[PDB]
Every structure is written in structure tokens, then in C-alpha cells.
CSV table of C-alpha atoms and ligand atoms in Angstrom, one decimal:
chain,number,residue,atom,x,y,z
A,1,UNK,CA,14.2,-14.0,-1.1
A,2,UNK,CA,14.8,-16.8,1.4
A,3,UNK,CA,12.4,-14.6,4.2
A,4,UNK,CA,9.6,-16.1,4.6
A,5,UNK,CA,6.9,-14.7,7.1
A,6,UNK,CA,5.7,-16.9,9.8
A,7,UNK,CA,3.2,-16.7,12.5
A,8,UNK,CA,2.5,-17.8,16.0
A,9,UNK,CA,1.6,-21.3,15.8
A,10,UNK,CA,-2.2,-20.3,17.2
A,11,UNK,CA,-2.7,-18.1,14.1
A,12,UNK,CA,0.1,-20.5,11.5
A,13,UNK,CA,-3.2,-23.2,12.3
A,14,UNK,CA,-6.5,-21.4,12.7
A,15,UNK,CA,-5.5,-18.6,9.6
A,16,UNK,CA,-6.4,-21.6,7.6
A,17,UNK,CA,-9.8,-22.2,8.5
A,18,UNK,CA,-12.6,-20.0,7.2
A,19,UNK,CA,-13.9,-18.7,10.1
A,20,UNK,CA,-10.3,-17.2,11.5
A,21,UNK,CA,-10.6,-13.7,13.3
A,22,UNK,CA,-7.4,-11.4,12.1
A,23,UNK,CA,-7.7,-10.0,16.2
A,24,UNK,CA,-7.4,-6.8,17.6
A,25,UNK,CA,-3.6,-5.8,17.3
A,26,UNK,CA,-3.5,-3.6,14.1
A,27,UNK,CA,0.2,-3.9,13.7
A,28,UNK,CA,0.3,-7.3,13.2
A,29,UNK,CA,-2.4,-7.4,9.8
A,30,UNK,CA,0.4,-6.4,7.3
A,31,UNK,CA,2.3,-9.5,8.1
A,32,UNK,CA,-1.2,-11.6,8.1
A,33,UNK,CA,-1.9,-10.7,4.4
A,34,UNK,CA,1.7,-10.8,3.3
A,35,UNK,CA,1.9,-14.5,5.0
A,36,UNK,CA,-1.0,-15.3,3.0
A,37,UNK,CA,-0.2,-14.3,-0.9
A,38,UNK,CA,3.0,-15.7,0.1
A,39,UNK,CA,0.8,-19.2,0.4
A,40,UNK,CA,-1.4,-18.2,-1.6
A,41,UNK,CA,0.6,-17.3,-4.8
A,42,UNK,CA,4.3,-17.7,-3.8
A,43,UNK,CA,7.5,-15.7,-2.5
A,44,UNK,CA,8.1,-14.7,-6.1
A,45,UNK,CA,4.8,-12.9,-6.7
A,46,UNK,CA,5.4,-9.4,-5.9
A,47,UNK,CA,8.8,-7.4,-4.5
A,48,UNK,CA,8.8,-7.8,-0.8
A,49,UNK,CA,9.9,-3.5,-0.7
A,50,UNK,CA,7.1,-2.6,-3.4
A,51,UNK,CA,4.5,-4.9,-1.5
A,52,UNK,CA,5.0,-3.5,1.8
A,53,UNK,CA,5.2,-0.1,0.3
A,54,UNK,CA,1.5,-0.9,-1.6
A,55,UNK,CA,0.2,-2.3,2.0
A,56,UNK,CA,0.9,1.0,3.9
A,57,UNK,CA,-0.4,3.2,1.2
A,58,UNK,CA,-3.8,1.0,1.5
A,59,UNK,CA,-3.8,1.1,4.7
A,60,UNK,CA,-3.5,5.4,4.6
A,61,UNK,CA,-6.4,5.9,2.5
A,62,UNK,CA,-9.0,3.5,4.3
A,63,UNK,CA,-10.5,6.0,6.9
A,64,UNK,CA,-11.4,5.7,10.8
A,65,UNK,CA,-15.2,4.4,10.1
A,66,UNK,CA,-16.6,2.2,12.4
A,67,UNK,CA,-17.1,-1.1,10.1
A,68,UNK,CA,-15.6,0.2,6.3
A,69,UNK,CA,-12.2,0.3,7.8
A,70,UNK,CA,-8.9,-0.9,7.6
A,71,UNK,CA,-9.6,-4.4,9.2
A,72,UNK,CA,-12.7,-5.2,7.0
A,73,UNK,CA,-10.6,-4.9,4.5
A,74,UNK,CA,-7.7,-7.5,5.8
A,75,UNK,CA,-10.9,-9.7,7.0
A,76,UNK,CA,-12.2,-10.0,3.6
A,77,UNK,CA,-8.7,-11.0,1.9
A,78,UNK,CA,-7.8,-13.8,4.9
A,79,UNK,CA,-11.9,-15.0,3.3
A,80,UNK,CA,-10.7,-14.9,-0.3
A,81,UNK,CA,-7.1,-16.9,0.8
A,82,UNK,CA,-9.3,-19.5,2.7
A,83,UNK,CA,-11.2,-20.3,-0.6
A,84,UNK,CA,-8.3,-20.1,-2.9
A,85,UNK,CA,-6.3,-22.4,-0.5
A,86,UNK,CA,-9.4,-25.0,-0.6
A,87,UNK,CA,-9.8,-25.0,-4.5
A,88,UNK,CA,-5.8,-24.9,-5.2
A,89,UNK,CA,-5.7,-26.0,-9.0
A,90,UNK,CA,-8.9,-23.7,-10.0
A,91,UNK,CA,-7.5,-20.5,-10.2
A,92,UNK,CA,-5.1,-19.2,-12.6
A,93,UNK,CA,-1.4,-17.5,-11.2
A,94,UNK,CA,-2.8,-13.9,-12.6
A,95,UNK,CA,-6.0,-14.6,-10.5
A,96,UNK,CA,-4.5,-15.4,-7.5
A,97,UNK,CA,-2.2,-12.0,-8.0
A,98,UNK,CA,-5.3,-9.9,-8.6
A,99,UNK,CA,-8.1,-11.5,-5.8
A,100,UNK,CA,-6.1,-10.7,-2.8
A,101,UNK,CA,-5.3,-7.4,-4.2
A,102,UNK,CA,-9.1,-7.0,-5.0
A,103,UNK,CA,-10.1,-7.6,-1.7
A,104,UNK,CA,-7.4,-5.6,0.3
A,105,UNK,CA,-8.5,-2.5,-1.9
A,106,UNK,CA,-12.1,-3.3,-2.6
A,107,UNK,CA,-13.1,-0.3,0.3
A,108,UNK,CA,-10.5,2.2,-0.3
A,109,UNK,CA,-11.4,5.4,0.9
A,110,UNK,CA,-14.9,4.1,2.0
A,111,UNK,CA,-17.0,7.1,4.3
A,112,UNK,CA,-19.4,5.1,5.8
A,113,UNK,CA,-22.5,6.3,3.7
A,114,UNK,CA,-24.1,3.9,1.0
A,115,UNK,CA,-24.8,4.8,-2.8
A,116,UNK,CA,-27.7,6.1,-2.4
A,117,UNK,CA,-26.9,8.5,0.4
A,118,UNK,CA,-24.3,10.3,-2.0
A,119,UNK,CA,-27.1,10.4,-4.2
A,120,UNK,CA,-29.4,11.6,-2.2
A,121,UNK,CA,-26.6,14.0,-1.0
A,122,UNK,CA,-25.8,15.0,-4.4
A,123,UNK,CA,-21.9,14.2,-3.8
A,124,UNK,CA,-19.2,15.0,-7.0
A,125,UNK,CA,-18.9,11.3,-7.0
A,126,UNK,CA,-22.2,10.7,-7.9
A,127,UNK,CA,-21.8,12.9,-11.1
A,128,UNK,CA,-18.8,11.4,-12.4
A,129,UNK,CA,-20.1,7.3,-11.0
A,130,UNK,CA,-24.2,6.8,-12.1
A,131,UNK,CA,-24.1,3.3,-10.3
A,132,UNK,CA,-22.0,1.7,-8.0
A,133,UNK,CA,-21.0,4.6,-7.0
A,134,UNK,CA,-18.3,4.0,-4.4
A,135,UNK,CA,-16.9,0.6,-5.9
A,136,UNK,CA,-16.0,2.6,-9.4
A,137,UNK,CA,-14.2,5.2,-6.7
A,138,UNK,CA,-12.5,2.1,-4.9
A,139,UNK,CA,-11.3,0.8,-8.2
A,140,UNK,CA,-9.6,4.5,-9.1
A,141,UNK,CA,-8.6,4.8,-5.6
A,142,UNK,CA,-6.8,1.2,-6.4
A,143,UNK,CA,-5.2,2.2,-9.6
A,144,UNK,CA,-4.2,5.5,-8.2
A,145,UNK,CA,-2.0,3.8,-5.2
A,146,UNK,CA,-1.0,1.3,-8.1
A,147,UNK,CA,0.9,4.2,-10.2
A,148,UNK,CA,2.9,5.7,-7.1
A,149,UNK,CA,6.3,5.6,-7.6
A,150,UNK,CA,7.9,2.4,-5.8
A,151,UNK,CA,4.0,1.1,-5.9
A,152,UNK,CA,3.4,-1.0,-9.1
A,153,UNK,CA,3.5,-4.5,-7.5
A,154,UNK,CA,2.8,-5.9,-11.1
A,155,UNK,CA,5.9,-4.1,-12.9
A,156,UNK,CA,7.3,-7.8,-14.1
A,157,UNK,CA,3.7,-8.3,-16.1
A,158,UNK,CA,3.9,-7.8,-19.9
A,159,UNK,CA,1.5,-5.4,-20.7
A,160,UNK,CA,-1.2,-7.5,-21.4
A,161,UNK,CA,-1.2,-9.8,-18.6
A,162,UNK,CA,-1.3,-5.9,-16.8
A,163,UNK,CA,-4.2,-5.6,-18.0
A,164,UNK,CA,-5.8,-8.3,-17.4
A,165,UNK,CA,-4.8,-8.1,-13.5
A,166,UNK,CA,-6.3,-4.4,-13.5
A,167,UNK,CA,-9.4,-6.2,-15.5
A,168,UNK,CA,-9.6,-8.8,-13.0
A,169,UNK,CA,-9.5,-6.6,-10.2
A,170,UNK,CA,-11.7,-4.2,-12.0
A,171,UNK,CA,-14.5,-6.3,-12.2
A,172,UNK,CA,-13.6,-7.7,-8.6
A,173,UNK,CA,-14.5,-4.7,-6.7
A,174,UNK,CA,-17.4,-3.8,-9.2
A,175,UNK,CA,-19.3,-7.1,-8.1
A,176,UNK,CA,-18.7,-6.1,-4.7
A,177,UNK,CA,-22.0,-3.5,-5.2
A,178,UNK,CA,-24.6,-5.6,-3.7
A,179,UNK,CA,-27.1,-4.1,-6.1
A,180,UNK,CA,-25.8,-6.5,-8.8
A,181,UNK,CA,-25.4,-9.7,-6.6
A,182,UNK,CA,-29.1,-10.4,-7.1
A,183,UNK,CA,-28.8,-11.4,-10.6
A,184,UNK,CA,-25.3,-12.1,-10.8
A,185,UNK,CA,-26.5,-15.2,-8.4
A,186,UNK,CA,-29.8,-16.2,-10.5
A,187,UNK,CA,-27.6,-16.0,-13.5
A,188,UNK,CA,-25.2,-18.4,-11.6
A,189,UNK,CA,-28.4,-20.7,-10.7
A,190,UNK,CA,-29.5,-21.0,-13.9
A,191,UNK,CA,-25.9,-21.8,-15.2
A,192,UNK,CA,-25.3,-24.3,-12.5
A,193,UNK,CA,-28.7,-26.0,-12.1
A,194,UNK,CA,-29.2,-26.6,-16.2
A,195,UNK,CA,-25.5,-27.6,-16.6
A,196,UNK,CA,-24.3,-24.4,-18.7
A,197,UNK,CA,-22.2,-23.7,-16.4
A,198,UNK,CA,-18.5,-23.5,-17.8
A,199,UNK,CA,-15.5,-22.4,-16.4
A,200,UNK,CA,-13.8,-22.1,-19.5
A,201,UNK,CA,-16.1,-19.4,-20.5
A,202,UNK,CA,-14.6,-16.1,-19.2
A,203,UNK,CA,-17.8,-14.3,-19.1
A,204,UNK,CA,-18.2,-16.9,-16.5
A,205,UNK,CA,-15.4,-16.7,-14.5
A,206,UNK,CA,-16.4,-13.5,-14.0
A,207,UNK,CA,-19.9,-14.4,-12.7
A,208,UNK,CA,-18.1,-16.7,-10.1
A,209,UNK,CA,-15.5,-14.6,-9.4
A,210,UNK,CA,-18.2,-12.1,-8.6
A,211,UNK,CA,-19.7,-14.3,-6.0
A,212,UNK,CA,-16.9,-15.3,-4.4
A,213,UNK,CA,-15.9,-11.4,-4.1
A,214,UNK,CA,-20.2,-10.8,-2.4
A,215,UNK,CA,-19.2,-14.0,0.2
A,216,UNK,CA,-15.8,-12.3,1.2
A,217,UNK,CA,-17.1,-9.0,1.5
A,218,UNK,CA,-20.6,-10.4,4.0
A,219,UNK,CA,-17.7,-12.6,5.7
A,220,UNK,CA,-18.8,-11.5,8.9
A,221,UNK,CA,-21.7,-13.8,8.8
A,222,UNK,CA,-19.3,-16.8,8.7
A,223,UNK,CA,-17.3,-16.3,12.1
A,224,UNK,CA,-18.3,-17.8,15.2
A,225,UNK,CA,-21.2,-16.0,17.1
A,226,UNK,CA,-19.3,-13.6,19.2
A,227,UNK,CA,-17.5,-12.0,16.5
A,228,UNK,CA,-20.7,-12.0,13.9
A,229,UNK,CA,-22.5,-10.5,17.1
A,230,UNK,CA,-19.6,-7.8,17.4
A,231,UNK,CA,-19.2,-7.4,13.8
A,232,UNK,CA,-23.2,-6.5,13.7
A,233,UNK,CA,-22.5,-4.0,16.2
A,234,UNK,CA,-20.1,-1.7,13.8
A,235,UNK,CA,-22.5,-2.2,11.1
A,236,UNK,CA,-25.3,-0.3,12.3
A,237,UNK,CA,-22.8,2.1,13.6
A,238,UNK,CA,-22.3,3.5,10.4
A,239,UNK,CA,-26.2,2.6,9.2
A,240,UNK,CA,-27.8,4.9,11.9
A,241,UNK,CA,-25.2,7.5,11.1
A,242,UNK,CA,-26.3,7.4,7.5
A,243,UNK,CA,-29.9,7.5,9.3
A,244,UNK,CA,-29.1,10.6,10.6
A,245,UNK,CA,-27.5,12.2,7.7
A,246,UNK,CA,-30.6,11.0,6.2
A,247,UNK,CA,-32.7,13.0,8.6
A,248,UNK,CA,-30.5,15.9,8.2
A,249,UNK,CA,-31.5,15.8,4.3
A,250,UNK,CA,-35.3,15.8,5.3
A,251,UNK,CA,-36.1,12.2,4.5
A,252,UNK,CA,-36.9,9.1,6.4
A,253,UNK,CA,-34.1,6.7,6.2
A,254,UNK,CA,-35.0,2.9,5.9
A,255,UNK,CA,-35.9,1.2,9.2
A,256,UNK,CA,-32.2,-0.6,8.7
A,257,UNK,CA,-30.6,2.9,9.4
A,258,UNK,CA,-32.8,4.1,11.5
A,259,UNK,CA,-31.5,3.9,15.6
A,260,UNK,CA,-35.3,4.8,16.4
A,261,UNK,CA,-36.0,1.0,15.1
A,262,UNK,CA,-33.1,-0.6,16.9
A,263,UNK,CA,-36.0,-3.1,18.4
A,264,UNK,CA,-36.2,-4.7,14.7
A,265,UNK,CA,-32.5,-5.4,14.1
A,266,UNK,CA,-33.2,-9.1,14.6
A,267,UNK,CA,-35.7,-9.4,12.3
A,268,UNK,CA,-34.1,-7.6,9.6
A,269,UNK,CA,-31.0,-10.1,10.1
A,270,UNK,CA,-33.1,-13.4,9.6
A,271,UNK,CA,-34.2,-11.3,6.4
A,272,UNK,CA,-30.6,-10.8,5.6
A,273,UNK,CA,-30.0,-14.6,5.8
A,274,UNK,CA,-32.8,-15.6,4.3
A,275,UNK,CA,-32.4,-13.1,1.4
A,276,UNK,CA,-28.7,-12.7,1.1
A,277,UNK,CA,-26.1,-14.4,2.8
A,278,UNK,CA,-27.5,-18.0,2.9
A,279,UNK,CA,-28.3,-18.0,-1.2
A,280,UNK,CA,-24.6,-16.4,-1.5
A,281,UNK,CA,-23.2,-19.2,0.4
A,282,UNK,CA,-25.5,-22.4,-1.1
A,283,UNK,CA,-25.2,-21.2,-5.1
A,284,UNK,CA,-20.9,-20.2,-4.0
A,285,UNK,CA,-20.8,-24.2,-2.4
A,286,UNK,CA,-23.1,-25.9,-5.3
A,287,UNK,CA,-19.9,-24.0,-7.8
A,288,UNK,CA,-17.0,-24.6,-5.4
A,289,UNK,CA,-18.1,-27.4,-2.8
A,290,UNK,CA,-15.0,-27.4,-0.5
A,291,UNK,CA,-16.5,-23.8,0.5
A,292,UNK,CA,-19.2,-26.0,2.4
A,293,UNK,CA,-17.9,-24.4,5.6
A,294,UNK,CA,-18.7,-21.1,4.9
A,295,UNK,CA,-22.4,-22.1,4.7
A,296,UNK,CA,-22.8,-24.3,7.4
A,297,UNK,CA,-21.3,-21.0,9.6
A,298,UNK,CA,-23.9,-19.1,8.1
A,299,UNK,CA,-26.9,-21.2,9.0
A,300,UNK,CA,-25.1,-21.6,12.5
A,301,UNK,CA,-25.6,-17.6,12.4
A,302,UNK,CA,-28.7,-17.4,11.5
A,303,UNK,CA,-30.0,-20.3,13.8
A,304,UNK,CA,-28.6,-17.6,16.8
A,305,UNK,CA,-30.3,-14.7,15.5
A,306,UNK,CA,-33.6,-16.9,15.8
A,307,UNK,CA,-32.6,-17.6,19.3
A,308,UNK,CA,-32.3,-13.5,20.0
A,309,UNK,CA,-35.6,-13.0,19.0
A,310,UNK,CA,-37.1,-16.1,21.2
A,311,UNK,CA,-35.4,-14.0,24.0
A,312,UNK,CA,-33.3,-17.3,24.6
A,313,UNK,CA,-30.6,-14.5,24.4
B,401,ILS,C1,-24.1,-8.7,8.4
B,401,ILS,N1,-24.0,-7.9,7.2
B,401,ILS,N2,-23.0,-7.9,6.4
B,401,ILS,C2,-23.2,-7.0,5.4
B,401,ILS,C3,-24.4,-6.4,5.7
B,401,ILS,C4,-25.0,-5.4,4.8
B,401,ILS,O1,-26.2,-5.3,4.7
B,401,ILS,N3,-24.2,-4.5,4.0
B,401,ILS,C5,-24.3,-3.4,3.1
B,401,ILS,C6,-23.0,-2.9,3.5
B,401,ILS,C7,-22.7,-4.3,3.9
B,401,ILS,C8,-24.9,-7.0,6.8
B,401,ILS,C9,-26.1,-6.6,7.6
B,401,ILS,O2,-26.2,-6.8,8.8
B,401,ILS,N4,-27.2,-6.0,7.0
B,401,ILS,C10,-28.3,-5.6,7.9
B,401,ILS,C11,-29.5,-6.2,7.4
B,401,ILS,C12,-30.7,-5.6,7.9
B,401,ILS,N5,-30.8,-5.1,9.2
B,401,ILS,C13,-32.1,-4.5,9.4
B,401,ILS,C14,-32.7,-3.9,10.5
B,401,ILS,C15,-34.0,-3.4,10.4
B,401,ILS,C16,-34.7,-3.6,9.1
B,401,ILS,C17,-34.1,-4.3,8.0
B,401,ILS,C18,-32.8,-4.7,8.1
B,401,ILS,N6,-31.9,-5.4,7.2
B,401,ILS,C19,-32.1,-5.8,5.8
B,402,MG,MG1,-18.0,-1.8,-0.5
B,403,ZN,ZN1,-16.6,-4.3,1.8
């Protein structure tokens, strides 16, 4: 009750900002997220025993993929904390509860291979999930964990604050399908730019919410160079692998997944800043302005991926 986590002062100051790396020791990333709902939501939010006991069992059913992996999954929580901790009196205490929990599960039991490859594939999961394939399985992988015994971190919920947490989180991991960022983001234009937009209205909410979840998950973009450049690196890991599963299918993958096409990786991230990330960022800081610094990292990003193709680097 009165045992707080705290951190090294180094990490206590930069796990603030929004462009703090978690770092490379594993065994210190359970403490990291349990440090931040404690900030983020309170002491009182969840059973210190059933929290740590939900943690591990996350942890043991994200896999050993290169970039879908256990620290992605811490990464984009500390990015969710840094926005709720910069909009304090937006959020509601059931949202704060579900994000974080969103975000920690919003991968579980990722295999490194897109929708469309377990389409192509003809995986069970594809049957049983039409679209967004993996994020429906990530949200059943979620509620699964969630009914363990000595797991349900939301067992002092009435039942229908319960289900609005699972509805929350539902929706949470949903949005994190880039397929449906697109409109969810032209929708949130329109909204914001003709002055519909209301955050009264839980329809949207949920569109914001949405967004916010799209600029955790493409965090990476965001960091300072050396880790974006890093980050990039495990990326493609898994693309080219899908590549090659593609290849194995008879079928030429995209040029993105392709390690025959590594010579156009630069290009295809200034159209990946230009097309994704840098729209997420402006319509997510036009909606939420003290998120400003997660844009102005992004253009920072992208302004070093022009100097890669200069051959300034
Ligand atoms: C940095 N980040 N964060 C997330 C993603 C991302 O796309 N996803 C889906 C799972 C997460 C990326 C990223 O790097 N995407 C790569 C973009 C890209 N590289 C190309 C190389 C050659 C041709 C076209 C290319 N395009 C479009
Ligand atoms: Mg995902
Ligand atoms: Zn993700």
C-alpha cells in the first residue's frame, strides 16, 4: 500500500518526456510500466500481486520476434503514459485503467507476419477474424490472460464499468490495425477543422482514442535518430521475413518486404512520413496540443531520412 516504485533519477526525469527509450535491460520493464500506472492512475488502481501476476503472463505470450516483441509493447505504453501525463484532466479514471492495459497487450502473441500474409497463408485465424485479423486475436489473447485465476486486475469494477474497460480496450487494440487509421484520421479532420468535434460524444472519444492508440503503436518515429534508426532496423527484419514467406507462397511480396529492394528503404520512409506518421502526429496535436513534441520528433525524423538519401549519411 505505502510501496511505491521509484526509479533511478536518470530514468525518474527522462521517463517523462516523450521521446524516453525503456533501454536494453529486460528485467527492469515490469517496474517501468508499474511506475507509470502508478502516476498515471494511482497506487489504488489495481492489486500490486494481481498486477504483477497480469505483467508476467503478458510478457509469456509475446514471442521472440525481432520488432513485435515484448519491448514494443512496454515502448508503446511509456508513449500512451507520456500523453496521458500531458492532458491530465482529459481522460476519465476507467480510461486511464484501460489505455495502458491497451497498449501493454495490444501485440500479444504477435508472429511477425501482417494480415494479409495469414491471408494469403490461409491461417485458422483468418477464418475465424475477416479483418484485422491479428488485433481481434490480440484482444482474445488479452481477455484470455484477463480470466486466469489470480489475473483479473479489474475485480473491484461493478459489472458495467467491466465492461466498459474491456470495451475501451476492445476498441483500443482494434484501432491499432493501420488499415482503419486512414479514415479514422479524415473523419477526425473533418470533425476538428469544421468544429464538430466533441468530446462529449463517445463515438468520438473513440475516434481520438483511436489515434492516440496509431501514434503509440508508430512511436518509434518519435525517438531521437539513433534509436528510430535502430528501431527501423528490427522492422524490416520481420518485413523481409514475411518477404520470404511470401516467396515461399509463390508471390512477389511488396518492395517494403522485399530484402532484394533494400536500396529503396529510404524512400519508402519519406513515404511513410509523408503518408502516415506526420498526418498522425499534426491531426493527434490539432486535438491534444500539449502532444506538439511528438510531431516536431517526427519531422526531426524525417528531415534525417532526407539526409540518408542525399548520402549526407
Ligand atoms: C517506422 N515504422 N513504424 C511502423 C511502421 C510500419 O509500417 N508498420 C506496419 C507494422 C508497423 C514503420 C515503417 O518503417 N514502415 C516502413 C515503410 C516503408 N518502407 C518501405 C521500403 C520500400 C518501399 C516502401 C516502403 N514503405 C511504405
Ligand atoms: Mg499490431
Ligand atoms: Zn504494435
Amino acid at each position: 500500500g505505502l510501496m511505491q516504485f521509484t526509479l533511478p533519477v536518470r530514468l525518474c526525469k527522462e521517463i517523462e518526456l516523450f521521446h524516453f527509450d525503456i533501454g536494453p535491460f529486460e528485467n527492469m520493464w515490469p517496474g517501468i510500466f508499474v511506475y507509470m500506472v502508478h502516476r498515471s492512475c494511482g497506487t489504488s488502481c489495481f492489486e500490486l500481486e494481481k498486477l504483477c501476476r497480469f505483467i508476467m503472463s503478458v510478457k509469456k505470450n509475446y514471442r521472440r520476434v525481432p520488432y513485435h516483441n515484448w519491448k514494443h509493447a512496454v515502448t508503446v505504453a511509456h508513449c500512451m503514459y507520456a500523453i496521458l501525463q500531458n492532458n491530465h484532466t482529459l481522460f476519465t479514471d476507467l480510461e486511464r485503467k484501460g489505455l495502458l492495459i491497451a497498449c501493454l497487450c495490444h501485440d500479444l502473441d504477435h508472429r511477425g507476419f501482417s494480415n494479409s500474409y495469414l491471408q494469403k497463408f490461409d491461417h485458422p485465424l483468418a477464418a475465424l477474424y475477416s479483418t484485422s485479423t491479428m488485433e481481434q486475436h490480440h484482444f482474445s489473447q488479452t481477455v484470455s490472460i484477463l480470466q486466469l485465476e489470480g489475473h483479473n486486475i479489474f475485480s473491484t469494477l461493478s459489472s458495467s464499468e467491466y465492461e466498459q474497460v474491456l470495451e475501451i480496450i476492445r476498441k483500443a487494440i482494434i484501432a491499432t490495425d493501420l488499415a482503419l487509421y486512414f479514415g479514422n484520421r479524415k473523419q477526425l479532420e473533418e470533425m476538428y477543422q469544421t468544429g464538430s468535434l466533441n468530446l462529449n460524444n463517445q463515438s468520438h472519444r473513440d475516434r481520438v482514442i483511436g489515434l492516440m492508440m496509431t501514434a503509440c503503436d508508430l512511436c518509434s518515429v518519435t525517438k531521437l535518430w539513433p534509436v528510430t534508426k535502430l528501431t527501423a532496423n528490427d522492422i524490416y527484419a520481420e518485413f523481409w521475413a514475411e518477404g520470404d514467406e511470401m516467396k515461399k507462397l509463390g508471390i512477389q511480396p511488396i518492395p517494403m518486404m522485399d530484402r532484394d529492394k533494400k536500396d529503396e528503404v529510404p524512400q519508402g520512409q519519406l513515404g511513410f512520413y509523408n503518408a502516415v506518421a506526420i498526418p498522425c502526429y499534426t491531426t493527434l496535436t490539432q486535438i491534444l496540443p500539449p502532444t506538439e513534441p511528438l510531431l516536431k520528433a517526427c519531422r526531426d525524423n524525417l528531415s534525417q531520412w532526407e539526409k540518408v538519401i542525399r548520402g549526407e549519411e
